[PDB]
């Protein structure tokens, strides 16, 4: 078969969505992983970056 | 037990967070537990054994 058993179309932003899950921790800027502030300066890459 | 040189919180180690190594003292000469002591802490199922 064609591999494209999947197909996708773009849209306008008809409506907002509440995806903006609140991180109280630090946000690992490049990854967006939410890490607890106690893991800052931890000596360990607990972020990705 | 806080800021002590031992991880007295077990999974977390928050008692050893943000602790100056110049303020720490050596808690003990050694850290090595007996060779499989963790097995002494497992639960047990009497039926399945």
DSSP states along A12-42: ---S--------SSEE-TTT--EE-GGGTT-
Number of Cβ within 10 Å of residue A28's Cβ equals 17
Q: Which of A25, A28, A47 is nearest to A36 (CA)?
A: A25
B14 touches chain A (CB under 8 A): yes
* CA distance, residue A36 to nearest chain B CA (Å): 11
Residues annotated within the binding site of A are: 39, 42, 44, 46
Q: What is the resolution of this structure in A?
A: 3.3
User: Which residues of chain A are within 8 Å of residue B17 when distances are taken between CB atoms?
Assistant: 38
Residues annotated within the binding site of A for Ca(2+) are: 39, 42, 44, 46
In terms of Cβ atoms closer than 10 Å to its own Cβ (0-12, 13-18, 19+), residue B46 is exposed
B25 touches chain A (CB under 8 A): no
Tell me which residue has tokens 């040189």. B5
Q: Nearest 10 degrees: CA dihedral of A39, A40, A44, A45? A: 100
- Its sign, for the CA torsion B36, B42, B48, B49, is positive
* CB contact at 8 A, B19 and B27: no
Query: Radius of gyration over alpha carbons of chain B, in Å?
Result: 16
Name the experiment that determined this structure. cryo-EM
Q: At a CB cut-off of 8 Å and minimum separation 6, what does A8 contact?
A: none
DSSP summary character for residue B47: T
């Amino acid at each position: 078969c064609n591999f494209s058993d999947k197909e996708v179309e773009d849209c306008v932003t008809n409506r907002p969505c509440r995806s903006q899950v609140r991180c109280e921790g630090f946000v690992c800027a490049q990854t967006g992983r939410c890490v607890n502030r106690r893991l800052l300066c931890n000596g360990d890459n607990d972020c990705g970056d | 037990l806080v800021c002590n040189g031992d991880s007295d919180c077990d999974e977390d180690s928050a008692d050893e967070d943000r602790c100056e190594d110049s303020e720490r003292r050596p808690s003990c000469d050694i850290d090595k537990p007996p060779p499989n002591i963790e097995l002494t802490g497992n639960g047990y199922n009497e039926l399945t054994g």
